[PDB]
RNA sequence: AUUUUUUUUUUUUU
RNA sequence: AUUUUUUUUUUUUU
RNA sequence: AUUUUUUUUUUUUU
RNA sequence: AUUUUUUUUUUUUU
């Protein structure tokens, strides 16, 4: 033996992910993503496995961490809809399930301080910030790579930015009793989150449904040494696995 | 005709009757299960997850703020936070033990309490975290709370102490509402030396309080919960 | 504990523990793992041996979720309907959305989770009142017609769909209740409390709401005709869910909803969190 | 320890019948432990 | 006695005794011992050979604590609720801290013991009248609703707690009667019909009411909407216990009661002991 | 559908009627027993326990004193007491026995009567104490309680006297309150010789009467007793 | 000497049931004697 | 109250 | 184009 | 610090 | 996450 808990590689496809400061992987429900069986089959159609192409790392744009940051959320297959292979055959298919292995990078040193919570969630149904029976409209559950931004501004039709009650009117400190990981500078500098496909259906439009969303929320505010940028960087990288697409059309088109 | 006798009670709707009834859509086939995972079979089981406990309660609005207990630095002999053990009230209020621990009347077993350090690695602490079984009061200075069930935490590589609430009681099961005889005692932090910081760090450094049930936990007597209400029905 | 399970007393609550000098620390954790490691007061303190004289039965979710709840109240009357244009304005008739998300109470305990399965059980309760002059209480008789979608939906309480050759009904006494038992009527395997999606891609479109928790509708009218006077007739729905299968469980809401499927709350709600009153070492 | 005789069903529906009762199988582990490598209670979780 | 039981007439109630002549006195005693000697009539006198046709079953402490009696008798009415800023004063709802120490002649059989454990069996009996000018009786409908400590309590008739997702309650008619049981739902392993002592260590605080002879409560509504006319209903709850098991026998009371859970007598009363109606000698 | 017929006494709700009902509260877990002891299973247990008769009724309030039956010294062929044999009235009504008694209308067996001399060590007496059964007078001489069910006690080292009162009757069961058909008799005490007191000794010396049943005994047909009203309910 | 035929139990609870019946129990000598030396009938009860 | 200590072998965490 | 999936046992890194 | 409790059989006073 | 490919034999349409 002699290895650590530490130091994880994770290898899919051509990309490779290394880490020598990990604190553990999260398998999702205690159960690794799988392709879908016979027995639980409903459509007809032979589904396409084009697993190399798109089951890979892609990685999202970097989020600046300040002090009063608030938190980043990110939908999924949404936020991997331009990323490759992958995204083009999101389009082009009207069925479509996949698992993830969610990667989240922020390193720093050992004089500073702060937590992250990295959390994902089945089924994220954000509330609007008006109340009522106002919706949320589509662009604003379907910002891409770029994710929501929670210490942004109120805008008409998208949803409520309010990290503390979790944009849904649960408060944030529950938010454990979803698959959960923490980023603490003083142990941790990754997170590593491995999700199954779960949903109510067999195999789901991949426009219309994000099956999860991946939270990154700034529990303890960050603490630069003296004389330090008051900033640090946040990456994401979510590969796709176990991915099926089924019923191959002609790219529908969504808003915008 | 089987001569029958109807007895007092006959025609009478108790909404916990479990009994039979015809069903209205008959040949009917429902879609089948498929496997989803995440699936649930008895409240024991979710609320041996640890949540955070909103303990630093001292703010006019809520905030992320209110999960973060303060730690300041080079102190000696104070105290870091304390609270009473009524788990249906208070800090735990709002918390997932303390949510579906309002479902119910009575609870018994052992709380699974939890401290993690968010401080710079090149730091260091030590600190007390001591439990005051019932028929004492809260515990005012260090050596108060010492004489009770307590563990000193060192801060080290592995940021999480993880200290449990045994079961001291007389009486089998507490009301999980607050009740004065089926009180469950008193709950502190102290520091045991000091919070050292690294040089070229200054400020404030946080603690982050969890609870969970053991498999210890018990829990009966359903009720209705004072966390939500309403005074109109809602409309699609 | 769960652990072992003895013979003379079963299922040990605590094992009798002494005093630890070790290198091995069961207290020292690191919660960055995403993992809650399974600490029993055996692990810090020294401990006897005590039994659970428990199963865990009343927190099974079969049930939690399986007492009746009320989830519609509505209101019928028996008047004379010559010279009323509108009958369901009049509320001649009156009928309901099959929703278990309208009395806050049992849709917290739904909402603790995010899919569920199960057979449904209605209880509906009617009870008359005459607020005006009347002479003697009416004899009446209600019909409750489950009216699936894409059912013709009943405009008068006359109306030719009452007589109901396909849907299912009920006639039962005003004072009296009826109970029947409803399937699992979800196109998926679950239903869904929570829906992170729309019914199609399109940039207005209604988030949320779903036919995935989509469990048909009731109608309600009295089969009487009118007397002299006007009785109004309460309708009360009670559900009572059994069979349960729940998944995925979520994080529990204490802000006060506003709607039905959705998950928005009023602007300017008050805080949740119980304020201290005194400082944070205050007991 | 009676048993109880309320077990002929009288309708031929499965909806129609009473609660199925506790289901005794009782896993905290997928929300407790949901990590990739096993953690043993003692060791440290780390290295 | 008890004794011998024989197989052709079984357990006799006198053996058959003649002349004594002896040194061993069985009815020379010792009361400051403690004790009562087992002296039987075949001790003193010359007695035949008697059986005891009887078991003594109905001074089984089941069937002597195990009839339905009358445990509390509150009252509500069904009357117009709008003006109205107190529901529970107008008596539209009326509440009832379970005790069984109220009617003072099933709390004296109760405290002829110490310690009680049972499980309850509750009959509620409803009752209207109008006594004022009505044209009709209403067919009303009350809710009782078990309400256990800590759980919200109603504030008016329509309020939001009668829905009772997770309390326990029963909807029936008005002349008839709802019957349920309740288990033991003692904190501790009995009841306490007495208990020296206090809730805490303090100087103020109250003596011997306490919560482990603590019941539950259960509150009562009319679910029925007003008519013209005002209608008193009268509830009366009926308690039998079952399953008794009881412990230490303890003096029987002969003063008056004058709380509940209080072992205090009224100032001033009556003696209870019978005078005699001439001197000590007279029959 | 089982076509049934219902019978009178439908809807009807008997007090004394031991059936089965739904319970409220399912799948709940009460606190299980632990050892207690002085365990009742039938009032015929205790019943068979001593104490004390207050019989010296002639106080204008109760008092410790009607305890006392009193003694005097130097008397010769007097009487010491006297009662009749209702033992759901007068002396008897108070006591142990005769307040579970009157929870029964009928009573069946054999009483037992004790009695305690309280006097100085150095002191003598005889007494005879005597029953008389029904049909004839309360005995005003001692000769005419000679002649039925009698014991002479000889006052010594052992300071109890135990005379049962056996089951003298013709119809098998008495009722409990005072019936003159189902009467039992009367009960009396006699002086044998004398009270002789030691010297330096004055005074009066005392007795103590004590009741209970023998195993004998039977009680059947419950109601409600006399012994307890109340004009209004009782509030906490 | 009939036997009763109302054995069949309709619920699931064990609170829902009737009545225990007689225990035939019986001992009233933990309350008649008390006494740590046994004391027989007919000998002296002190030395 | 016929209980107290000396010490054996088995079980729960090695 | 007689190919597709269901799943077995062996080999390469355990 | 591989110790703690559950309880067995033997010895000292029965 | 001890999975991936090489290829065997069986089943569905030959």
């Given at each position: 033996?002699?290895?650590?808990?530490?130091?994880?590689?994770?290898?899919?496809?051509?990309?490779?992910?290394?880490?020598?400061?990990?604190?553990?992987?999260?398998?999702?429900?205690?159960?690794?993503?799988?392709?879908?069986?016979?027995?639980?089959?409903?459509?007809?159609?032979?589904?396409?496995?084009?697993?190399?192409?798109?089951?890979?790392?892609?990685?999202?744009?970097?989020?600046?961490?300040?002090?009063?940051?608030?938190?980043?959320?990110?939908?999924?297959?949404?936020?991997?809809?331009?990323?490759?292979?992958?995204?083009?055959?999101?389009?082009?298919?009207?069925?479509?399930?996949?698992?993830?292995?969610?990667?989240?990078?922020?390193?720093?040193?050992?004089?500073?301080?702060?937590?992250?919570?990295?959390?994902?969630?089945?089924?994220?149904?954000?509330?609007?910030?008006?109340?009522?029976?106002?919706?949320?409209?589509?662009?604003?559950?379907h910002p891409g790579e770029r994710g929501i931004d929670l210490?942004?501004?109120?805008?008409?039709?998208?949803?409520?930015?309010?990290?503390?009650?979790?944009?849904?009117?649960?408060?944030?400190?529950?938010?454990?009793?979803?698959?959960?990981?923490?980023?603490?500078?003083?142990?941790?500098?990754?997170?590593?989150?491995?999700?199954?496909?779960?949903?109510?259906?067999?195999?789901?439009?991949?426009?219309?449904?994000?099956?999860?969303?991946?939270?990154?929320?700034?529990?303890?505010?960050?603490?630069?040494?003296?004389?330090?940028?008051?900033?640090?960087?946040?990456?994401?990288?979510?590969?796709?696995?176990?991915?099926?697409?089924?019923?191959?059309?002609?790219?529908?088109?969504?808003?915008? | 005709?089987?001569?029958?006798?109807?007895?007092?009670?006959?025609?009478?709707?108790?909404?916990?009757?479990?009994?039979?009834?015809?069903?209205?859509?008959?040949?009917?086939?429902?879609?089948?299960?498929?496997?989803?995972?995440?699936?649930?079979?008895?409240?024991?089981?979710?609320?041996?997850?640890?949540?955070?406990?909103?303990?630093?309660?001292?703010?006019?609005?809520?905030?992320?703020?209110?999960?973060?207990?303060?730690?300041?630095?080079?102190?000696?002999?104070?105290?870091?936070?304390?609270?009473?053990?009524?788990?249906?009230?208070?800090?735990?209020?709002?918390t997932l033990l303390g949510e579906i621990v309002q479902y119910?009347?009575?609870?018994?077993?052992?709380?699974?309490?939890?401290?993690?350090?968010?401080?710079?690695?090149?730091?260091?602490?030590?600190?007390?975290?001591?439990?005051?079984?019932?028929?004492?009061?809260?515990?005012?200075?260090?050596?108060?709370?010492?004489?009770?069930?307590?563990?000193?935490?060192?801060?080290?590589?592995?940021?999480?102490?993880?200290?449990?609430?045994?079961?001291?009681?007389?009486?089998?099961?507490?009301?999980?509402?607050?009740?004065?005889?089926?009180?469950?005692?008193?709950?502190?932090?102290?520091?045991?030396?000091?919070?050292?910081?690294?040089?070229?760090?200054?400020?404030?450094?946080?603690?982050?309080?969890?609870?969970?049930?053991?498999?210890?936990?018990?829990?009966?007597?359903?009720?209705?919960?004072?966390?939500?209400?309403?005074?109109?029905?809602?409309?699609? | 504990?769960?652990?072992?399970?003895?013979?003379?007393?079963?299922?040990?609550?605590?094992?009798?523990?002494?005093?630890?000098?070790?290198?091995?620390?069961?207290?020292?954790?690191?919660?960055?793992?995403?993992?809650?490691?399974?600490?029993?007061?055996?692990?810090?303190?020294?401990?006897?041996?005590?039994?659970?004289?428990?199963?865990?039965?009343?927190?099974?979710?079969?049930?939690?979720?399986?007492?009746?709840?009320?989830?519609?109240?509505?209101?019928?009357?028996?008047?004379?309907?010559?010279?009323?244009?509108?009958?369901?304005?009049?509320?001649?008739?009156?009928?309901?959305?099959?929703?278990?998300?309208?009395?806050?109470?049992?849709?917290?305990?739904?909402?603790?989770?995010?899919?569920?399965?199960?057979?449904?059980?209605?209880?509906?309760?009617?009870?008359?009142?005459?607020?005006?002059?009347?002479?003697?209480?009416?004899?009446?008789?209600?019909?409750?017609?489950?009216?699936?979608?894409?059912?013709?939906?009943?405009?008068?309480?006359?109306?030719?769909?009452?007589?109901?050759?396909?849907?299912?009904?009920?006639?039962?006494?005003?004072?009296?209740?009826?109970?029947?038992?409803?399937?699992?009527?979800?196109?998926?395997?679950?239903?869904?409390?929570?829906?992170?999606?729309?019914?199609?891609?399109?940039?207005?479109?209604?988030?949320?709401?779903?036919?995935?928790?989509?469990?048909?509708?009731?109608?309600?009218?009295?089969?009487?005709?009118?007397?002299?006077?006007?009785?109004?007739?309460?309708?009360?729905?009670?559900?009572?869910?059994?069979?349960?299968?729940?998944?995925?469980?979520?994080?529990?809401?204490?802000?006060?909803?506003?709607?039905?499927?959705?998950?928005?709350?009023?602007?300017?709600?008050?805080?949740?969190?119980?304020?201290?009153?005194?400082?944070?070492?205050?007991? | 320890?009676?048993?109880?005789?309320?077990?002929?069903?009288?309708?031929?529906?499965?909806?129609?019948?009473?609660?199925?009762?506790?289901?005794?199988?009782?896993?905290?582990?997928?929300?407790?432990?949901?990590?990739?490598?096993?953690?043993?209670?003692?060791?440290?979780?780390?290295?």
């Amino acid at each position: 033996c002699g290895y650590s808990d530490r130091v994880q590689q994770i290898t899919l496809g051509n990309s490779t992910i290394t880490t020598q400061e990990a604190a553990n992987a999260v398998v999702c429900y205690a159960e690794w993503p799988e392709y879908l069986p016979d027995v639980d089959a409903s459509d007809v159609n032979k589904t396409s496995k084009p697993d190399t192409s798109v089951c890979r790392f892609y990685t999202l744009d970097s989020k600046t961490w300040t002090t009063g940051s608030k938190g980043w959320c990110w939908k999924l297959p949404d936020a991997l809809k331009d990323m490759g292979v992958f995204g083009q055959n999101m389009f082009f298919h009207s069925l479509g399930r996949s698992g993830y292995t969610v990667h989240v990078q922020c390193n720093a040193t050992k004089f500073h301080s702060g937590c992250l919570l990295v959390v994902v969630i089945p089924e994220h149904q954000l509330a609007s910030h008006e109340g009522g029976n106002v919706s949320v409209k589509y662009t604003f559950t379907h910002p891409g790579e770029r994710g929501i931004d929670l210490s942004s501004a109120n805008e008409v039709g998208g949803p409520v930015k309010d990290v503390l009650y979790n944009m849904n009117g649960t408060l944030l400190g529950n938010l454990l009793i979803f698959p959960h990981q923490f980023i603490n500078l003083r142990t941790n500098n990754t997170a590593t989150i491995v999700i199954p496909y779960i949903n109510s259906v067999p195999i789901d439009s991949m426009t219309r449904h994000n099956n999860v969303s991946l939270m990154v929320i700034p529990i303890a505010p960050l603490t630069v040494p003296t004389g330090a940028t008051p900033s640090l960087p946040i990456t994401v990288t979510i590969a796709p696995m176990c991915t099926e697409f089924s019923g191959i059309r002609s790219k529908s088109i969504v808003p915008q | 005709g089987l001569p029958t006798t109807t007895l007092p009670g006959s025609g009478q709707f108790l909404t916990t009757d479990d009994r039979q009834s015809p069903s209205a859509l008959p040949n009917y086939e429902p879609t089948p299960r498929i496997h989803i995972p995440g699936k649930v079979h008895n409240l024991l089981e979710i609320i041996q997850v640890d949540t955070l406990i909103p303990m630093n309660n001292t703010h006019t609005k809520d905030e992320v703020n209110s999960y973060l207990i303060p730690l300041n630095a080079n102190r000696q002999n104070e105290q870091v936070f304390g609270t009473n053990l009524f788990i249906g009230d208070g800090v735990f209020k709002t918390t997932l033990l303390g949510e579906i621990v309002q479902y119910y009347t009575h609870w018994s077993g052992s709380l699974r309490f939890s401290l993690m350090y968010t401080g710079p690695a090149l730091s260091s602490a030590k600190l007390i975290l001591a439990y005051t079984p019932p028929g004492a009061r809260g515990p005012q200075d260090r050596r108060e709370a010492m004489l009770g069930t307590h563990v000193v935490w060192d801060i080290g590589l592995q940021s999480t102490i993880v200290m449990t609430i045994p079961w001291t009681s007389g009486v089998q099961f507490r009301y999980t509402d607050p009740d004065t005889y089926t009180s469950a005692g008193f709950l502190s932090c102290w520091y045991q030396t000091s919070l050292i910081l690294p040089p070229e760090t200054t400020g404030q450094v946080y603690l982050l309080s969890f609870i969970s049930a053991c498999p210890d936990f018990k829990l009966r007597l359903m009720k209705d919960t004072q966390t939500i209400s309403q005074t109109v029905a809602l409309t699609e | 504990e769960e652990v072992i399970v003895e013979k003379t007393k079963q299922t040990v609550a605590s094992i009798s523990s002494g005093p630890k000098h070790t290198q091995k620390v069961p207290i020292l954790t690191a919660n960055e793992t995403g993992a809650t490691m399974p600490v029993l007061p055996s692990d810090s303190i020294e401990t006897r041996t005590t039994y659970m004289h428990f199963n865990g039965s009343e927190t099974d979710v079969e049930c939690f979720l399986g007492r009746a709840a009320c989830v519609h109240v509505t209101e019928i009357q028996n008047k004379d309907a010559t010279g009323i244009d509108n009958h369901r304005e009049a509320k001649l008739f009156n009928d309901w959305k099959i929703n278990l998300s309208s009395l806050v109470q049992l849709r917290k305990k739904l909402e603790l989770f995010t899919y569920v399965r199960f057979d449904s059980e209605y209880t509906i309760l009617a009870t008359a009142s005459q607020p005006d002059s009347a002479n003697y209480s009416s004899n009446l008789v209600v019909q409750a017609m489950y009216v699936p979608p894409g059912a013709p939906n009943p405009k008068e309480w006359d109306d030719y769909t009452w007589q109901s050759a396909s849907n299912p009904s009920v006639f039962f006494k005003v004072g009296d209740t009826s109970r029947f038992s409803v399937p699992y009527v979800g196109l998926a395997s679950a239903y869904n409390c929570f829906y992170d999606g729309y019914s199609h891609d399109d940039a207005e479109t209604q988030y949320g709401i779903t036919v995935l928790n989509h469990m048909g509708s009731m109608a309600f009218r009295i089969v009487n005709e009118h007397d002299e006077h006007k009785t109004l007739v309460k309708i009360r729905v009670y559900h009572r869910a059994k069979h349960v299968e729940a998944w995925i469980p979520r994080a529990p809401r204490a802000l006060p909803y506003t709607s039905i499927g959705r998950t928005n709350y009023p602007k300017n709600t008050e805080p949740v969190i119980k304020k201290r009153k005194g400082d944070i070492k205050s007991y | 320890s009676n048993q109880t005789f309320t077990y002929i069903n009288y309708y031929k529906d499965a909806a129609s019948t009473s609660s199925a009762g506790q289901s005794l199988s009782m896993d905290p582990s997928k929300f407790t432990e949901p990590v990739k490598d096993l953690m043993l209670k003692g060791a440290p979780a780390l290295n």
